[PDB]
Amino acid sequence: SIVKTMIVDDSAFMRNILKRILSTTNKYVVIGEAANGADAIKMAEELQPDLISMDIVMPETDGITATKAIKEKTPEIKIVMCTSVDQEQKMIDAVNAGADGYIVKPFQAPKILEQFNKLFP
């Protein structure tokens, strides 16, 4: 009934839009945010979310590196990549890294909820 969620994106305004969308749901409760993949790995270990929304392109450590690391340690965490046209070229890397789904910027709330609810019926 509650899905503990992390939001990872180097863009604060994209994190904020996604937080506002999820805030309208009792179900997806945001428990942490991170702005790069290294912080995401550490936060995932500390918080043990059910779900991570993972931007792909981020400075220093990207979402592919973070997805692989988190999947190696705690494979039960669902990781949904947060993609966009400018990240298209990294989507196959995310498939190979074990992503569980995708949501798309610019955000559409119904599509996000469809995607999340498929993983958390």
Q: Which residues bind Mg ion (CB under 5 A)?
A: 10, 55, 57-58
Positive or negative, the CA dihedral 82, 86, 87, 88 is positive
By beta-carbon proximity to Mg ion, the closer residue of 33 and 55 is 55
The distance of closest approach from Cβ of residue 1 to Mg ion in the complex, given in angstroms and rounded to an integer, is 31
- Distance, in Å, from the CA atom of 104 to the CA atom of 95, rounded to the nearest integer, reads 15
The distance of closest approach from Cβ of residue 76 to Mg ion in the complex, given in angstroms and rounded to an integer, is 25
Q: Confirm or deny that 9 is annotated as ligand binding.
A: yes
What kind and span of H or E run contains 12?
helix 12-23
The distance of closest approach from Cβ of residue 69 to Mg ion in the complex, given in angstroms and rounded to an integer, is 17
- Distance, in Å, from the CA atom of 50 to the CA atom of 32, rounded to the nearest integer, reads 12
Q: Where is the binding site, in residues?
A: 9-10, 55, 57
